[PDB]
């Protein structure tokens, strides 16, 4: 079902897409997986830490 | 020798982003320059952000106005999200005044004929009741980058300056069969603007400052 | 917002009290950012009291843990509501669904050992979104004492100090309202008799806005002006 | 971790990739054959080695 | 005020022999080491002009897996060494060159004949060795003056990978740099190394002005 929800999309099945390297241009062989993660900030500032 | 590429068309799809096509290039050459270009458009660009905000009736960020149903710093981040161009000056204190039932856009803004504000359909806020009024200062000025309050009256809101006009660039080398010679590239430049850059302009600009950066040792 | 949730992340936001949930369904009549008021149906409103509710919501506050506690409208002037809807998602939470963090665009490489063993790799865009910036309110009290030697004042005549030091305080020696103080800045002015300095001051590295002063004094102490 | 992971993709041959078999006059070559895009990372080739 | 950048200047260019060096760059605008250094770096090792031997012809060699007599190395090695010959050729384009020599002992760049305008700088540069008296080895390379890196793979004669940039190894390293109050910036290092036939900071020098004029249709 996610790789039938990725093809109703204009997505690759599977997953990865090739991708750029930011400073020198070139493409990153092997592609790598790209996607949204819903990340969290814990309570462990640096700031109350240091 | 060595063909010099030039700006042969900027197709203007939709307001904010565009699309520039450079011809010729020779082999690899037409990375270099995108890459290149990109990195400097993404960087380093002039822009117009809100500085500084001054509501009347509001002395700190963290409270609430009678009749307008978005918090203070919710209508600070609408205001930091304002896309507009300033021509003859460097800073300059647009004003709002508004009232009655409805969504604060950014089209009630002075005009302050020099100003021009892109998207006047940009919601700031919402008034709620008929005898609520709001009346703010927004001090937008020119800048490079991004400078956050951290860096740099107690009614006095200060916003994050945002100064880039530039959201997103891509780039892609395609073949130029032209001038009955082949193995040439094309270098189309893809940018999505806010709307207060024009992509030749951009493109002129990211150019000057790879020249004069190249004056070091030459 | 959570892409990818569960389906319990309603139940989470709603069975906890963080949210203004509609008590009568009916249609929401006015709306600010500190205040909801419906106007409850005739179908399910009681035969005599008219009759509508009013919802306080809870702005800027302190929570437990230092944090911002703050609920948001999420209805528009003359929107219909029901029993049981959502009328303000406090905080972490998006028209009444669960929402603790962001959801990002993630790439899973090597990136020059910058997350060489657990750690991430950033971009600037999500520091200039402001969307994992978080609110933090502090608490800070000064109090006089019934101490020996004399009592202790709240003025604001201090020593060893200058008047640029002193001039974001109002002439009862409390900050004002608003004032962008920051670490070493002077809160609440307050002196001890032998006088020696002991006024309530920011803690070094803190920055901030001061966003609500209370005065608590005990029966007769004629309380100063600011009180 | 990474380091180990990079040097074992580095040194590491598959059985036909970009430039296979060319004769390498030293490992600055093989850099900027890299480096080009001229040839693969793990391309099995003859290079001179002192 | 948001026009002019933070330029730098060659604060340091510290060298080894001729054919290496290592120049930087402080303090460049924050990011703005990574762009010039791949720039730099891909102008220098993909598209400088130069010159190098295209391709060998041998008397009695017909194939690049062969052998000839009273030769201690093979085809294959005899033309790594070819390849790695430094060569300036004046203004015209290509150019065939002879090599006829008997006797034991090794041969040598200089062994070529004098005769032309085209220069070696590496005259000691040995390109094979021979064992006996009665074998002659002859040979005809010929020069040409190309656009970097072409292969042999990219179609009695021998093919030799030409190598025309006079760059053999360059490399950016972008650094962290310091000015009296702002901290975010770098520093760029280049080191280089080249086959002699120019300066490294002539190669430097040569690959900002081809960048400089890839630019003059929009500064």
Not at chain 2, 43 to 56: F, K, L, N
Not at chain 3, 202 to 211: A, D, K, L, R
Request: hydrophobic letters at 40%; a negative charge; proline letters at 4%.
């Amino acid at each position: 079902e996610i790789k039938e929800l990725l093809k109703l999309g204009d997505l690759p099945t599977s997953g990865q897409i090739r991708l750029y390297d930011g400073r020198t241009g070139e493409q990153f062989e092997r592609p790598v997986t790209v996607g949204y993660m819903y990340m969290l900030k814990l309570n462990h500032l640096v700031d109350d830490k240091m | 020798e060595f063909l010099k590429p030039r700006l042969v068309d900027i197709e203007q799809v939709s307001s904010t982003h565009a699309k520039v096509t450079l011809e010729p290039l020779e082999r690899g050459f037409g990375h270099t320059l995108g890459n290149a270009l990109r990195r400097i458009l993404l960087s380093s660009m002039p822009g117009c952000a809100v500085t500084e905000v001054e509501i009347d009736g509001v002395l700190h960020e963290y409270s609430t106005k009678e009749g307008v149903q978005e918090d203070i710093l919710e209508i600070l981040l609408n205001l930091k999200g304002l896309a507009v161009r300033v021509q003859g000056k460097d800073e300059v204190i647009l004003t709002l005044n508004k009232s009655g039932i409805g969504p604060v856009t950014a089209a009630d803004i002075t005009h302050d004929g020099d100003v021009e504000i892109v998207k006047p359909q940009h919601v700031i806020c919402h008034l709620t009741d008929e005898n609520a009024s709001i009346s703010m200062r927004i001090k937008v000025q020119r800048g490079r980058g991004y400078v956050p309050a951290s860096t740099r009256p107690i009614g006095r809101l200060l916003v994050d300056a945002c100064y880039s006009p530039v959201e997103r660039i891509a780039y892609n080398v395609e073949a130029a069969r032209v001038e009955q010679r082949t193995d040439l590239d094309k270098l189309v430049i893809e940018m999505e603007t806010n709307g207060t850059i024009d992509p030749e302009e951009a493109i002129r600009r990211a150019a000057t400052i790879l020249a004069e950066q190249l004056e070091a040792f030459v | 917002k959570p892409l990818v949730g569960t389906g319990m992340e309603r139940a989470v936001a709603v069975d906890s009290g963080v949210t203004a949930v509609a008590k009568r369904g009916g249609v929401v009549q006015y709306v600010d950012a500190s205040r909801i008021v419906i106007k409850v149906n005739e179908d399910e409103m009681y035969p005599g009291e008219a009759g509508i509710d009013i919802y306080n919501l809870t702005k800027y506050t302190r929570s437990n843990q230092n944090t911002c506690i703050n609920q948001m409208p999420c209805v528009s002037l003359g929107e219909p509501v029901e029993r049981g809807d959502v009328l303000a998602d406090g905080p972490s939470t998006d028209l009444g669904e669960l929402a603790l963090g962001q959801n990002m665009r993630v790439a899973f490489m090597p990136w020059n050992g910058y997350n060489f063993e657990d750690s991430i790799l950033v971009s600037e865009r999500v520091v200039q979104e402001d969307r994992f910036t978080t609110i933090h309110i502090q608490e800070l009290a000064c109090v006089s004492r019934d101490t020996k030697l004399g009592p202790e004042e709240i003025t604001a005549d201090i020593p060893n100090v200058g008047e640029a030091a002193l001039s974001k305080l109002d002439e009862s020696g409390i900050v004002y309202i608003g004032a962008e103080v920051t670490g070493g800045d002077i809160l609440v002015g307050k002196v001890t008799p032998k006088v020696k300095d002991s006024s309530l001051r920011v803690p070094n590295g803190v920055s901030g806005t001061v966003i609500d002063v209370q005065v608590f004094t005990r029966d007769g102490v004629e309380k100063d002006k600011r009180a | 971790q990474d380091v180990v992971l990079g040097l074992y993709y580095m040194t590491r041959d598959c059985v036909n990739a970009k430039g296979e078999g060319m004769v390498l006059t030293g490992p600055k070559e093989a850099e900027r054959l890299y480096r080009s895009g001229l040839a693969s990372l793990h391309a099995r080739v003859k290079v001179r080695i002192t």
